[PDB]
Amino acid sequence: LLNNILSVANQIIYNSAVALPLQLDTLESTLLTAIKSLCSWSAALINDNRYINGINQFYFSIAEGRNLTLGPLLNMPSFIPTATTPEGCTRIPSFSLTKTHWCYTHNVILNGCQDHVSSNQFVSMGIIEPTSAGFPFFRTLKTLYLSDGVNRKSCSISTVPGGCMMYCFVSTQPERDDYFSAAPPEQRIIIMYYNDTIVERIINPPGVLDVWATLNPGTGSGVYYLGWVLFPIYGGVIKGTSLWNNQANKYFIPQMVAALCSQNQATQVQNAKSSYYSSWFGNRMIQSGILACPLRQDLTNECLVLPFSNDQVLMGAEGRLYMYGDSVYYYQRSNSWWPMTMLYKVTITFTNGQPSAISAQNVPTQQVPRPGTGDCSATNRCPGFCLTGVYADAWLLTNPSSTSTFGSEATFTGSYLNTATQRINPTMYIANNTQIISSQQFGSSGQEAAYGHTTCFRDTGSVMVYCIYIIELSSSLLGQFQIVPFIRQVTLS
Amino acid sequence: TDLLNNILSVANQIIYNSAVALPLQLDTLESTLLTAIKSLSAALINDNRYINGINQFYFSIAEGRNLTLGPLLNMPSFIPTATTPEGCTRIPSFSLTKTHWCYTHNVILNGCQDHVSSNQFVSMGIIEPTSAGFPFFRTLKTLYLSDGVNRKSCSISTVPGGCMMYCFVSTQPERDDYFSAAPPEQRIIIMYYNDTIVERIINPPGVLDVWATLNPGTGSGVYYLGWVLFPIYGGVIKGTSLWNNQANKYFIPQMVAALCSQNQATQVQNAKSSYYSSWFGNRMIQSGILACPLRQDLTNECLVLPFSNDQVLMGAEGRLYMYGDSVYYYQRSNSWWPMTMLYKVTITFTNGQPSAISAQNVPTQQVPRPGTGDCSATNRCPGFCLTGVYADAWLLTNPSSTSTFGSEATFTGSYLNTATQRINPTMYIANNTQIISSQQFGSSGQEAAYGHTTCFRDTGSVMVYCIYIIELSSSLLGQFQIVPFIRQVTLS
Amino acid sequence: ITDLLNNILSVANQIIYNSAVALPLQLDTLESTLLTAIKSLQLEQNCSWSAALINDNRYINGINQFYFSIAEGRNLTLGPLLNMPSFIPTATTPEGCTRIPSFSLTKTHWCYTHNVILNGCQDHVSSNQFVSMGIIEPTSAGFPFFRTLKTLYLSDGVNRKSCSISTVPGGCMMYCFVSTQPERDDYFSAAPPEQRIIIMYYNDTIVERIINPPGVLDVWATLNPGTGSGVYYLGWVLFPIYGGVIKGTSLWNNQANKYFIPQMVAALCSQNQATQVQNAKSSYYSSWFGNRMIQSGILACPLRQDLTNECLVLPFSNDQVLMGAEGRLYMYGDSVYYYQRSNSWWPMTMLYKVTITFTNGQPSAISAQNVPTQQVPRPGTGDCSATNRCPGFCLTGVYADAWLLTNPSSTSTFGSEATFTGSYLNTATQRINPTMYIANNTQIISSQQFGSSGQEAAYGHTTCFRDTGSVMVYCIYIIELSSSLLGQFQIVPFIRQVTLS
Amino acid sequence: LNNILSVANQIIYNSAVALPLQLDTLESTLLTAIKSLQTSDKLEQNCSWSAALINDNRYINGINQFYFSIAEGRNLTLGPLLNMPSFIPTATTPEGCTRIPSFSLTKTHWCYTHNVILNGCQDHVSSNQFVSMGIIEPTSAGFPFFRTLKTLYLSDGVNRKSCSISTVPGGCMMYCFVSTQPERDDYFSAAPPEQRIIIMYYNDTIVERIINPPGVLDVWATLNPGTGSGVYYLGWVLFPIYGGVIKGTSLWNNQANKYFIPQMVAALCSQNQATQVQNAKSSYYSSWFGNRMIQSGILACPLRQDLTNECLVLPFSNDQVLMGAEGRLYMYGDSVYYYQRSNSWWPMTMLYKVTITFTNGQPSAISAQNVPTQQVPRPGTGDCSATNRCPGFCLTGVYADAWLLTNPSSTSTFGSEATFTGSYLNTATQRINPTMYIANNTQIISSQQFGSSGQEAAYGHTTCFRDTGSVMVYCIYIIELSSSLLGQFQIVPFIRQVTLS
Ligand SMILES: *[C@@H]1O[C@H](CO)[C@@H](O[C@@H]2O[C@H](CO)[C@@H](O[C@H]3O[C@H](CO)[C@@H](O)[C@H](O)[C@@H]3O)[C@H](O)[C@H]2NC(C)=O)[C@H](O)[C@H]1NC(C)=O
Ligand SMILES: *[C@@H]1O[C@H](CO)[C@@H](O)[C@H](O)[C@H]1NC(C)=O
Ligand SMILES: [Ca+2]
Ligand SMILES: [Ca+2]
Ligand SMILES: [Ca+2]
Ligand SMILES: [Ca+2]
């Protein structure tokens, strides 16, 4: 025996966790495609046939991943609005794409890039349709501008059937002051349907009052998973709470640190433990996690807050959730001591139809660094307390689970700021665990930039993968920043 | 001993997958599917604050003297930019009525000097107030015409339910259009909010064998008494009725005489000759209006109505406007007179069809436009010229309110403030003889091109806002970025 | 060990349970709830179903074919005229005029159209255009009735002229140009007239569009449909065209030096090859019509309801065809054929097999092989009468198409013995004495003049088909006749059998 | 611990075979049902809807009304003939005979029919019957087009004769008898000919029924529809009829000693009053036609697809009406009117208002009030020509109906000044000189003759209606004209304006 059931009961995990959920996923797509072929209708809000089957997947096998190269930039009419004054500040994009449609949002501040009193939030939704030269056009089918005195900040957006769910917090003071007060900022979820119904709810997740000093959405896309909307969150946890106590003495050091940090192992461990706690931000434990909301117009306390185990994950930061086939993935901003791209496979367990636990498996990487200040520049390799960095997510082009060891040879794409400490030199790239294998810098040396959001998808007609690279660029002319959706091909060379 | 622990650890995951993960997946697959099949113009309306503030003269003559430009206001630009360094967006057209707005521009992938192959972007939407009190141009639909047809020089106009765009199809360099005796393909595209699109080749009567070429003027058309009026211009062939009827006619604006010292005979002779171009195939260069009835089955119902050359300068690009019930025309100064040309247009109908047009100039010596050679911003004397740039203007007071038409008129727009170069974009308010308020955008040397200006009133706050759609030379993305600046015209 | 054995059994049993009855059950429940949501989305008392628009079983397999063997072709004669209720409308005043029929019949139905002039034939300004469609059904006497299922009357003040029509599935496609000045002025002026495609369905949808085929503007001074039927072929609608081409264009240059002399002229004209060749070359160029090259061709249109510039113009090579003229397209099985009106120096019936070559799904070239004949002349003026045999420039003639009763391709040499039928005006110079006939390459073997001598007539369109119930071939001869009582000119659908003897 | 392969193989097979097979099958069921909706909406694309069969808005409110006031009636004149594409089909051989039209127009649409005989105008064995239906729409010149939307040709060996037609919602009802022998023989035999009602709907449903109204058999030796239109009235279709009644029957008995002498006859006939009354009584009996009482009447049919004997025969009182003859029924607003052809001694137009009384939802009685007239004669033979004024037995005349332009009820004395229009053969004894006219009780006030002197003609059916859009009244005059070139006859729908000038 022994050897007989092992591979068989392993073939049942494959049968149940990859084979059947793929058949179901594929099933949903062919029926969707079948539905559109049956007063601007909501059935206008469906992507071209060419893309419905090429969204939220790993597009390349491990072998193909070796030969990937960036095509040249393609010109399309940007769906992202710019500022119309020099001091107008458009920042903090969030972008989500499903089989049917996409959602986009960003924050607008009228005068400069700091304002804890008033801002507005632009939202749009639309579809992808092919042009004449074959390449995609992001067709906006609706916009909204939430401008009503509620300072909605750090918003994450996700597609839902029929429209968008956006998750925001309401800013009334400087970020540091949120870490020091005991009560958290107000949390809101806004649902915006293509049929023009808009319902906004102030939400009260259990386990948040008197536990989390502050709580923010991660700014990167949420995802629609099993009838729930999952959003990335982070914040500050108060001392002496159960969550705090349950997280005590936990730390996570990524697989490739040991060979790169010459500091002694015991000191690495003590430094890594100390890295989840910020004296600057009110002596709170800085915590990443997921917020799970059921898709309902009647929301109050049904949303769940689920923290990641600090054994599995770095200090709390902005982030993004993804769906690749049937697995959920999490990008965590590197706001701590490890300056390399952080991607995890997230296992979610439901109990009584509800998410009750999450678990994170890192894709071990030493590639694509991020600028930071002080002792936590792109060159640091050693655990310690750091509170600095920048958002730069990454899209997985190959399946980390395709290798016998998880993520042994992983391939991903995104943008990054190629410098040690400054926010300059935005560079689009494709990378593996150890090396950048394809790269093109945008603009001249010293060109300023900030956050970068990357999303890829396949035209199943031309069998082509495109990636959109949404980058905040410093504008010399109009606006402090111009959020640009670069689009280009990821080609098998 | 130690395979039994992870054989039941695994067999509990198979319980989970079959009893939780998969049935939840099925519940959700059922859920999103039912939603998609559940999906099987009362919105597309401007806010109450603007519906009664559109297409009017906003100020009295007396008030006009105290108008000044307010600071630029920050709204989300509804005009899409390029996403490559060489990407080119050019030739905007913007139209706003009571219920909604329409917008369009031309997109060239490989730089602004490629004149074959392009795409045309279109959007429409409404205006709503923001918490700071100023307007937001809310886009409710976009379209990208990208089928390989080189649609060029497009004008757009709102219609009830949507937009009507007038384009021509360019298949050869401009100059060849004037030389060939067969005119280019003319198209009318109608795009409704309900996502119906109808596009048709039109052939107005009296075009074939009369007009060597014909273009929309790029400025907005207007919807007037059931018809859609677009500006047009082009080249008329020697020996036709239209050429003959137009023979010996010429127009010299009121204010030219005091500024030009040539003998009257020379001015007249030179003015007669400015309507004819040896460079463009010896055609008479001609301005007019295209009148289309609003229908979805257009072939030859659209009418071409030339202006008399006694009333109007050499044919050029232009724009139509509605102020109350009066139609006005802006005519680009592509000839010898470099100042802003605005006219009240009187349209006569015979048996339900526009049969004639007449133009009365608002006499002006203000807001020059850069041009080459002897036809720069400083020229004051009649001659043949084929140079200039588009720079429309919005009348803030009624030229009909004075005893003599246009004796004290006030208008606003952008212009490029140099003699010969297209640099230094400046938003201004002016009267007939002087600029009374002006704000340059960017630094000296900032390159720019066309500018479309449109004003409207917030009847909640009684503030007038103008949008100045300016074509700006860009260093970051694209060779050009078309920007809709917005600011108050303030009474002080 | 007992714990962690008995555990699996009852657990792996629940898995069998989950996978065999529990999960398939949720699948059945799922299927039912959305089949009962798909059906829940969706009138025959009010419907005239388009399978009315179906020819009778007696004709569906008898249309667009060669009906006789070469041997049977020698023994064909015309039967007596048969009386049906004409489907072609006449005038209601003495001065009304109907002219220029076009008629198309395929497997399922027929289409018909003609031009209506209110005040006499001489008025070429303003007219209206009558359109009809229907099917054929047998009568109790055994012969066809052309049953009209819809009429239309295009009457909006637009001067639609020279219209050709073709069936399409579900209806008709008509091709017209718009006339705004006399014919000769169309050749002189450098911009072509407006072209239109009108699609009319049995379901009452009508879309009419102006079209602009590539390579027309600044190349064709004018362009007309040839008035003969177009055909529906491989998803495209082909129409005969003609017009005048401007000097120094690619097309003019590409035709330079080309001419065509039919295979039987040599035995009939007694002039040295040098002059015959030079005169043939010249016959393609009309000084009277603005020094244009007068040119034949085919217009190819995709069947779609949003036409702008997809229609293509393909000229015939002048090495293969005579001077441009009115014409007609045919289908005999899978082969396209072209009849070309003899408006030039050769007065005999001109029929060709057309080879159409495609490229990327679009037609790109046409080749024409003549069926060499010397029979059925047509009346003309001056030196280009019925009796003329020599090359040279002429601009006179009349439309007189002909239907092929046997296959030109069945012989060793193409067209060495062809049999065709039509009508013709049996005089040399006048439009007089309409005569229905059957003829081979050299002789008229069966002929029946209609009316008294001096009876005035004009165009003739002939269409044949077979009753597969009785194995009888019927030909309909649509002839323009001078009228007295009502109208100045009338168009009549004569029908008779073509019988073997 | 060996049984964990018996289950493990059932786990795999369930998740790898059983479930993917089911998910695949389940997918097909959903797509079959989705394509089922794709197919159902594509059926609608194959339909011409009954909604097509509706007159343009300009005419809908302009139908079946008195158009002019009494005073406006004095200033009416005929406009020039207008030219439209005739909806009435002609013959395609010289001997083909089209005769006996019937035409019915209502709010929504019109119905037309006539008889076709293949060889000559005489036949009692075989003929066919053309039928059509359609609408009226305006042209650019402003005047109507009668647009055909469906045509039928009943050709099946049943010799349908003397057909009258009427519109019904969504189509037409036609009434014919079946002719198997000469007319005279019908009057001599006791059993009447076969009577048929055919209903023809736009949706293509056709139901023919042989009918047997009570009170016919052994009472009427023969019975024919009037040929003139019927009308659709309060759910019933009414048809004119006439025929020969048998001696000794209740109807004959109840009609004995009745007669009708029009109000304007005394002043015009010198004969002794006793000699007049005697002849008027005798004028209802034909010794030539099997010694029968020649009777006019009306047949009333419920609108049902399953008719047998629900149809009713209601004769007119011979005190109220002349000898039995062809005729026509009208709706002017809510009033039913009746034209009786003048086949007897009095050669002038006979119009009557008809009152129909209903007994429990069924017509039971009819009465006729004559519009007193001495205008519009009709040709006849011997002592009953257009000039004759004195009672006697005549059996001669021709069908020539009339449309009332003004309301005879709008004067104190019913029809003291009435205005009507039609055509008539303007000669004393012969069928020549067809003339369209407007007349009042005593004089013709407007008149245009058609064709040359001696133009032969026969029946004339006249129908007027109003373009409410332009406020013009138009009258269609359907006249059988002798033809030479093609056909014995050519039935023509002349149209002109009746202008208030
Ligand atoms: C999308 O919205 C359009 C309106 O905003 C709508 O167009 C309207 O469509 C009807 C029929 O197509 C037009 O109808 C006319 O009705 C008859 C037929 O000619 C005449 O009696 C009238 O005089 C008139 O001509 C309307 O004119 C047209 N409205 C406008 C403003 O153009 C489209 O039909 C809509 N598309 C869909 C999917 O329904
Ligand atoms: C809008 O759509 C959602 C589902 O997509 C539905 O639940 C909601 O009630 C809809 N609102 C309206 C007004 O249709
Ligand atoms: Ca706080
Ligand atoms: Ca040209
Ligand atoms: Ca021409
Ligand atoms: Ca009998």
Residue numbers in the entry:
A (entry chain C): 64 to 101, 111 to 565
B (entry chain D): 62 to 101, 114 to 565
C (entry chain A): 61 to 102, 107 to 565
D (entry chain B): 65 to 565
Task: Copy out sentences from the published article reporting this entry, exactly as the authors wrote them.
Here, we report the structure of the PIV5 HN ectodomain (residues 61–565), which adopts a hybrid state compared to the previously observed 4-heads-down and 4-heads-up conformations. Upon optimizing conditions, HN crystallized in the I4 space group and diffracted X-rays to ∼2.5 angstroms. Two disulfide-linked heads are in the up position, while two are in the down position (2-heads-up/2-heads-down), and the structure exhibits a novel non-covalent DOD interface between one head in the up position and one head in the down position (hereafter, the DOD interfaces observed in the 4-heads-up and 2-heads-up/2-heads-down conformations will be referred to as DOD1 and DOD2, respectively). A stalk/head interface is indeed observed in the current structure, which resembles that of NDV HN in that covalently-linked heads are in the down position allowing one head to form a similarly sized interface with the stalk (buried solvent-accessible surface area = 1,294 and 1,185 Å2 for PIV5 and NDV using similar methods, respectively). Like the stalk/head interface in NDV HN, the PIV5 HN interface is primarily hydrophobic with 28 hydrophobic interactions and 5 electrostatic interactions including two hydrogen bonds and two salt bridges. The stalk of chain B extends beyond the 4HB core, which ends at residue L101, forming an extended alpha helix through N110. This extended helix also corresponds to the positioning of the head of this chain higher than its covalent partner and is consistent with the 4-heads-up conformation, where one head of each covalent dimer extends higher than its partner leading to a ∼30° offset between covalent dimers across the DOD1 interface. A novel dimer-of-dimers interface lacking pseudo-tetrameric symmetry is observed between one head of one disulfide-linked dimer in the up position (chain A) and another (chain D) in the down position (DOD2). This ∼2-fold symmetric interface buries ∼1,139 Å2 (total) of solvent-accessible surface area and includes 16–17 residues from each of the two heads.
